[PDB]
Amino acid sequence: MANRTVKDAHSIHGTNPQYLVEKIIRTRIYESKYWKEECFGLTAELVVDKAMELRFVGGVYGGNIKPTPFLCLTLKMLQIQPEKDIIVEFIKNEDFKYVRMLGALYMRLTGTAIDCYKYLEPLYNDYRKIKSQNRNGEFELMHVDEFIDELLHSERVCDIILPRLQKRYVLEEAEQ
């Protein structure tokens, strides 16, 4: 119910795919109102339904750790562990601005180093805006290029830590 939505499909870069976020954030997100209504059933087609309905980009907020549905759908996608074609489909789809942002978080967390720079580079040309939940719970406006540059920035995303295999300069000496 909360261990892994696949018995034996694949694995994360250094641990289990469910243990990719912090354990303090994963324990509070496992007991939530938006999580308990979603973790009872979630499929590949059902993941596209819940992600398109929500328009928010953030993590925890409030005194108690209250996870946003963007982080809740990110953990349900990491527990399901879909194929690379479905993750590339959610990043290239222009049906919602939050749909491409939800695929980018699953790309920078579990994807390869060469695949992360190849997929997030066309996302830098987007000039649209989105709403972000701050630390005090209030909404803040953030551009799509501002969130995509933050994923390629230092590891300071909302409950996310996964460095690349190198920087952009060290990868430039080996490949494009």
Partner: peptide, 16 residues
Amino acid sequence: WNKIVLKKWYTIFKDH
């Protein structure tokens, strides 16, 4: 310092 929550018998303090 953003990931520290002070508590005194389930009384989570604010940030302001």
